[PDB]
Amino acid sequence: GTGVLTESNKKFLPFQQFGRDIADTTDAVRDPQTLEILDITPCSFGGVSVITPGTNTSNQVAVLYQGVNCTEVPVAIHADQLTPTWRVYSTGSNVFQTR
Amino acid sequence: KYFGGFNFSQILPDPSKPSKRSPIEDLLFNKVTLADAGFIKQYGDCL
Numbered sequence: 001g002t003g004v005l006t007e008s009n010k011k012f013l014p015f016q017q018f019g020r021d022i023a024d025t026t027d028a029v030r031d032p033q034t035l036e037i038l039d040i041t042p043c044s045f046g047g048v049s050v051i052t053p054g055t056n057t058s059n060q061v062a063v064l065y066q067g068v069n070c071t072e073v074p075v076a077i078h079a080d081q082l083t084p085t086w087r088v089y090s091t092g093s094n095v096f097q098t099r
Numbered sequence: 100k101y102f103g104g105f106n107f108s109q110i111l112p113d114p115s116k117p118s119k120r121s122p123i124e125d126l127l128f129n130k131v132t133l134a135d136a137g138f139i140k141q142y143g144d145c146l
């Protein structure tokens with residue numbers, strides 16, 4: 001699997017090795033070398049919507065990142081990101097955190 | 100707020116409430132707010 005790994009705070013019984021969520025997907029696991037409970041969560045995802053005045057009127061665009069905190073938004077990662085070809089400029093274009 | 104002796108305090112918005120709302124509207128909000136979108140864009144509670 002692919003995801004981000006952090007130390008799992010969930011108390012994990014000695015006979016227990018795997019943890020599963022409501023969907024029963026594995027969310028926690030103990031490292032084989034040393035038993036270390038580690039929570040697995042998916043790498044950051046979010047829908048992207050493009051706001052445009054209209055190609056006839058102009059070519060400027062506005063990009064909205066659906067349901068993402070502005071600081072946690074990945075902009076420096078051009079190489080490893082879906083829709084990688086967009087650098088979506090940077091913070092230089094003023095960024096507003098909307099609801 | 101006098102209207103021919105008719106009292107409209109319940110239905111009218113209340114400045115005391117931080118979100119200007121009717122006292123009746125305040126009640127209706129509390130009962131049926133079983134679920135929400137959560138507005139959790141930080142997702143820091145997870146992990």
Ligand SMILES: *[C@@H]1O[C@H](CO)[C@@H](O[C@@H]2O[C@H](CO)[C@@H](O)[C@H](O)[C@H]2NC(C)=O)[C@H](O)[C@H]1NC(C)=O
Binds near residue numbers: 101102103
């Ligand atoms: C009539 O409109 C007046 C405003 O011009 C309001 O005055 C009320 O009645 C007397 C004088 O009319 C005031 O001393 C009271 O203080 C007012 N009532 C309240 C609840 O403050 C009133 O809204 C209207 N009704 C009457 C009967 O005057």
Ligand SMILES: *[C@@H]1O[C@H](CO)[C@@H](O[C@@H]2O[C@H](CO)[C@@H](O)[C@H](O)[C@H]2NC(C)=O)[C@H](O)[C@H]1NC(C)=O
Binds near residue numbers: 107108
């Ligand atoms: C209109 O209705 C309001 C709200 O029902 C009433 O205000 C009450 O006033 C008394 C006397 O101070 C208080 O003991 C009550 O607690 C008040 N009601 C509430 C719900 O807090 C009153 O009948 C009318 N008030 C006006 C200004 O017209």
Ligand SMILES: *[C@@H]1O[C@H](CO)[C@@H](O)[C@H](O)[C@H]1NC(C)=O
Binds near residue numbers: 033034035
């Ligand atoms: C290999 O893992 C086992 C237990 O999982 C234990 O011998 C030790 O932690 C590891 N061995 C070495 C040499 O690190």
Ligand SMILES: *[C@@H]1O[C@H](CO)[C@@H](O)[C@H](O)[C@H]1NC(C)=O
Binds near residue numbers: 069070071097141
């Ligand atoms: C994003 O996270 C930071 C720090 O937690 C802060 O700006 C704020 O809590 C979040 N922004 C929101 C909720 O708009």
